[PDB]
């Protein structure tokens, strides 16, 4: 009633992400630093995972 299969979990084929947004992106796992403009620490309690910055350009119309 249980397979008891022993393998590293990988659902990368079931989420529908394009292939070049999986093997090319580099995620950062970190606790965000406290904003030095303020003395509060409530924004440094959890962990954040984010993606690497890619190119941003200027729209020819309206800039």
Residue 29 backbone dihedrals phi, psi, to 5 degrees: -110, 120
Q: Is 58 in the site for other proteins (CB under 8 A)?
A: yes
Site for other proteins in 16-55 (CB under 8 A): 16-18, 21, 24, 34-35, 38-43, 45, 54-55
Compute CA distances 42 → 13, 18, 39, 58, 62, whole Å.
37, 36, 10, 35, 38
**CB of residue 28 to other proteins, shortest distance in Å:** 15
SS3 21: helix
| Site residues, other proteins (CB under 8 A) | 1-7, 9-11, 13-18, 21, 24, 34-35, 38-43, 45, 54-63
């Amino acid at each position: 009633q249980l397979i008891a299969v022993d393998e590293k979990l990988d659902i990368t084929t079931l989420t529908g992400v394009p292939e070049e947004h999986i093997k090319t992106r580099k995620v950062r796992i970190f606790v965000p630093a406290r904003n030095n403009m303020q003395s509060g620490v409530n924004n440094t309690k959890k962990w954040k995972m984010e993606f690497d910055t890619r190119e941003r350009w200027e729209n020819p119309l309206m800039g």
